[PDB]
Design a protein around this ligand. Sequence first.
Ligand SMILES: *Cc1c(C)c(=O)n2c(=O)c(C)c(C)n12
Ligand SMILES: [Cl-]
Ligand SMILES: [Cl-]
Ligand SMILES: [Cl-]
Ligand SMILES: [Cl-]
Ligand SMILES: [Cl-]
Ligand SMILES: [Fe+2]
Ligand SMILES: [Fe+2]
Ligand SMILES: [Fe+2]
Ligand SMILES: [Fe+2]
Ligand SMILES: [Fe+2]
Ligand SMILES: [Mg+2]
Ligand SMILES: [Mg+2]
Length: 310
Amino acid sequence: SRKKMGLLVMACGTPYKEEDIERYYTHIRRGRKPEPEMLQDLKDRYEAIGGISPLAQITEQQAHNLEQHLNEIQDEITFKAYIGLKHIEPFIEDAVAEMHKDGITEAVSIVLAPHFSTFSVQSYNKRAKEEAEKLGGLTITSVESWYDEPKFVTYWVDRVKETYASMPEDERENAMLIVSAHSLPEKIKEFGDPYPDQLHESAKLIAEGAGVSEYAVGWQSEGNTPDPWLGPDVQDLTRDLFEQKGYQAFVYVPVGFVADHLEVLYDNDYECKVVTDDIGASYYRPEMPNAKPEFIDALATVVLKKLGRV
Ligand SMILES: *Cc1c(C)c(=O)n2c(=O)c(C)c(C)n12
Ligand SMILES: [Cl-]
Ligand SMILES: [Cl-]
Ligand SMILES: [Cl-]
Ligand SMILES: [Cl-]
Ligand SMILES: [Cl-]
Ligand SMILES: [Fe+2]
Ligand SMILES: [Fe+2]
Ligand SMILES: [Fe+2]
Ligand SMILES: [Fe+2]
Ligand SMILES: [Fe+2]
Ligand SMILES: [Mg+2]
Ligand SMILES: [Mg+2]
């Protein structure tokens, strides 16, 4: 009959309620509890973007919809989704342990971040595989990147085309597309990490499919460590390009992110919008994929291609 396979869907995680902010950020900060002013700031930011709990639901919806779509579009494998998160329960290791307890012996994994990096994707995949090895009798084949899946490129291409079509003529003629992902420490370059190259390729593919000749690649959401992070940051890039050529509209495609979270709804829709409001340009940031059918179909195609079934 149908072969059973685990579908390990991995992501960063989000707090589930305001009282989870402390523990989630302590985890991201490697055990350093945020000071009270930062905790208050973070709560205010989540309030300003409409609340925490919707953000927390998106990953679950993505995993659910992906499982059901994969099971509909082919007839050989029955997938069961398990969510494994980096910074809050259910953790990657919990998910693998659950797959093992449930009798899964073969799984495929995907990280809900389309570009490979050594800091994120490789670390999630290594955590999942090490837990599988420790438990024994369960193997995981892991997607490493998927930014170049044509269906995923097309998601963003069509959103960009719609945004440009929506602009008044003077904006459309004097607009800049900024394509971004989460910054990482610059030291990843010592490993030959392809993350920057893959962001630039994402940007090339999206601008090309959308027919957008003027675009730039930037990074966002860098951390505070003395070591440099990848730049330029989108806020500085926006101002710099404005000072160079006077763009009247900036379109932000944070292609490294697949769902609403603070690092889009705040780091673009507030922090970049501050800059565009200051320089008098219009701000546009098309919808994140979230759990939209077009994006789920792209992910399902990524998974089936990884398994050689397409
Ligand atoms: C840790 C964290 C925060 C605060 C945020 O907004 N996001 C994302 O969008 C990702 C992918 C991660 C991780 N985080
Ligand atoms: Cl990997
Ligand atoms: Cl891959
Ligand atoms: Cl890769
Ligand atoms: Cl949109
Ligand atoms: Cl859709
Ligand atoms: Fe409460
Ligand atoms: Fe459903
Ligand atoms: Fe479907
Ligand atoms: Fe560049
Ligand atoms: Fe971050
Ligand atoms: Mg590839
Ligand atoms: Mg920041």
